[PDB]
Design a protein around this ligand. Structure first.
Ligand SMILES: CCN[C@H]1C[C@H](C)S(=O)(=O)c2sc(S(N)(=O)=O)cc21
Ligand SMILES: OC[C@H]1O[C@H](O)[C@H](O)[C@@H](O)[C@@H]1O
Ligand SMILES: [Zn+2]
Length: 249
């Protein structure tokens, strides 16, 4: 399987031809019409555990994205979730243009990147909880992202792995006060096999990176071990909401 962009220069199955569960009815990502999302008072604050601890994370190019291995060293609870969820991995989706790098959209507005923090239910439509943050260009270098951005030139090819300098997950997120507002729905993984087992949370507040930090991703990373196709536009096309609803805090 591949993204649309990889087909043009392949030395593979494009998104509209993906099999498995990818052609089903409760798929992700979606466009969120914010006025159509109903406030649900049960969507309380998230509580984070291990997000404040400095770690040296392993980060790897898996041929589709760059992925930090979180190795169960952090967890979340609250946020209307039925149970705590263990953190498994963090990865991103991006482009090199400001309005075609996110997977989800808000009222038709797209962003430059989207970051996905993937967690698994501690014990189904909510086996996996993904925390989704939308990214745009701001005025300044986001210092919290510097260890990740700095690591990228050490994993230019698929299968490569490196160790980031000391950093926390908290360093990557908005101020906690700004995480109170989010959107919630049930959907799928955004890559094959597209399993309908994800409870999604899309935070309303964008993260800001400097333009140069966002461009680093497409400038330093490659889809192929021949380094001829720059990694970008790793974005699944929008899927239909159908008879689901979106709720918000
Ligand atoms: C390369 C895609 N990997 C898949 C399977 C992995 C086992 S996972 O962590 O479940 C996961 S989370 C997402 S996303 N884009 O919906 O957040 C995709 C993936
Ligand atoms: O866009 C400006 C913002 O960029 C990002 C920085 O981490 C933040 O501190 C700053 O306020
Ligand atoms: Zn993702």
């Amino acid at each position: 399987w591949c993204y649309e962009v990889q087909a043009e220069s392949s030395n593979c199955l494009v998104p509209v031809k993906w099999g498995g569960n990818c052609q089903k009815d409760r798929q992700s990502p979606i466009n969120i019409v914010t006025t159509k999302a109903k406030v649900d008072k049960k969507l309380g604050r998230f509580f984070f555990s291990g997000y404040d601890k400095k770690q040296t994370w392993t980060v790897q190019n898996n041929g589709h994205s760059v992925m930090m291995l979180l190795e169960n060293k952090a967890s979340i609870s609250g946020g209307g979730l039925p149970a705590p969820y263990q953190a498994k991995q963090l990865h991103l989706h991006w482009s090199d243009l400001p309005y075609k790098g996110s997977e989800h959209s808000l009222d038709g507005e797209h962003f430059a990147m989207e970051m996905h923090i993937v967690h698994e239910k501690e014990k189904p439509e909510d086996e996996i909880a993904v925390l989704a943050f939308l990214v745009e260009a701001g005025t300044q270098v986001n210092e919290g992202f510097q260890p990740l951005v700095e690591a990228l030139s050490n994993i230019p090819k698929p299968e490569m792995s490196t160790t980031m300098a000391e950093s926390s997950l908290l360093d990557l997120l908005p101020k906690e006060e700004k995480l109170r507002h989010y959107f919630r729905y049930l959907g799928s993984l955004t890559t094959p096999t597209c399993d309908e087992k994800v409870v999604w949370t899309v935070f309303r507040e964008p993260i800001q990176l400097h333009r140069e930090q966002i461009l680093a991703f497409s400038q330093k990373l490659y889809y192929d071990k021949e380094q001829t196709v720059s990694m970008k536009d790793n974005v699944r096309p929008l899927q239909q909401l159908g008879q689901r609803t979106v709720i918000k805090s």
